[PDB]
């Protein structure tokens, strides 16, 4: 029924990157996603204490959420595109996995990765 410590954003011997698909990831996919009407429950770690959720951190053990995302592309946490295309998609996942279908949340979600793999589809060849 406890929070966990949230993800790692900082980690200074993590060998770092800024390619141009990670700023397509910070300019484009994160900056859309953010500023959605849906956001609002992806933009920090779930607060399962607040939220009532005692379970939730038995169930999901890869936390991801879009306050961590954007912190990690900030902050440059990453070396790769991939790196943060899973943080994008274990968000998505840990959200189906604890909820059921048709939930607002789900619903929440399934709206903003419809628009995560629009972008994605246009992420640039890397140079
Ligand atoms: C993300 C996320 N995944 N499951 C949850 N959340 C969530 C997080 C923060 C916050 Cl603040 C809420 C939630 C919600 C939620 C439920 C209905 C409408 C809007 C948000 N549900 N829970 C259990």
């Not at 429950?41 to 204490?49: E, G, H, S, T």
């Not at 879009?66 to 946490?77: P, V």
């Amino acid at each position: 029924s406890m929070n966990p410590p949230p993800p790692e954003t900082s980690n200074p011997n993590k060998p770092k990157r800024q390619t141009n698909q990670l700023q397509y990831l910070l300019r484009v996919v994160l900056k859309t996603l953010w500023k959605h009407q849906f956001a609002w429950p992806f933009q920090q770690p779930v607060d399962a204490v607040k939220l009532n959720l005692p379970d939730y951190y038995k169930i999901i053990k890869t936390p991801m959420d879009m306050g961590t995302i954007k912190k990690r592309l900030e902050n440059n946490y990453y070396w790769n595109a991939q790196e943060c295309i899973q943080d994008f998609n274990t968000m998505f996942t840990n959200c189906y996995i604890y909820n059921k279908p048709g939930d607002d949340i789900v619903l929440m979600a399934e709206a903003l990765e419809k628009l995560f793999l629009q972008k994605i589809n246009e992420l640039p060849t890397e140079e």
